[PDB]
Design a binder for this molecule. Sequence first.
Ligand SMILES: [Zn+2]
Length: 256
Amino acid sequence: WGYDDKNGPEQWSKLYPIANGNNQSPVDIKTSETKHDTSLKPISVSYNPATAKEIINVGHSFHVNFEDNQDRSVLKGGPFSDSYRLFQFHFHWGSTNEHGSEHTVDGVKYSAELHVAHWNSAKYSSLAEAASKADGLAVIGVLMKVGEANPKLQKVLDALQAIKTKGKRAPFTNFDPSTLLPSSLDFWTYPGSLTHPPLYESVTWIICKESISVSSEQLAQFRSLLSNVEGDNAVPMQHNNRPTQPLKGRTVRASF
Ligand SMILES: [Zn+2]
């Protein structure tokens, strides 16, 4: 599967019928229809920089993975009653610098999107197992607005020089992803899914109200990564964002 048109979002259902599921992500957040839940608690992230482990080119994107054998780095609060263990952060972007986020707000597509994913360590034993359960995953989505360069992205950008092609991995340590999050962590939340195959509807989304910046040349760097394996002709990672899916009667709750 991919993002091109032969194997892209509009073709995924042919292989993953859940693509047409009732809790698909991303979604358009219509700020006027959001429900303020007074039961929501502020989200509390507590990550240990020593759990940062590797950066890897997965072809369609790059992942920054973390050690997930303990509760050193967790997400708590929000709509949760238990702790979610951090396992990874990655991004989404588009072919253009101004339209590449997954989630949209009031129909407005942002330049890129940051996803911080965690799995339900309390109810399940492994990411593998939790990945398909309704309460399995918790993902923080942060909208990125093209503008001023974001200096907090530099270690990630620098690391990309070592994983130019698919399957390349490089150690990526001592990084606390909470440094990528906005100032305020007011959020929107809804039950949804993974935004690409397997498309499991196992995610509890936390979309930060506040966006963060990125510059044009910072995004050009992501698109400079290669989807091919070393040695083959160059095939740029031009985009990896999935179009918004019907809400299908879900409610987006707000922290405020
Ligand atoms: Zn993602």
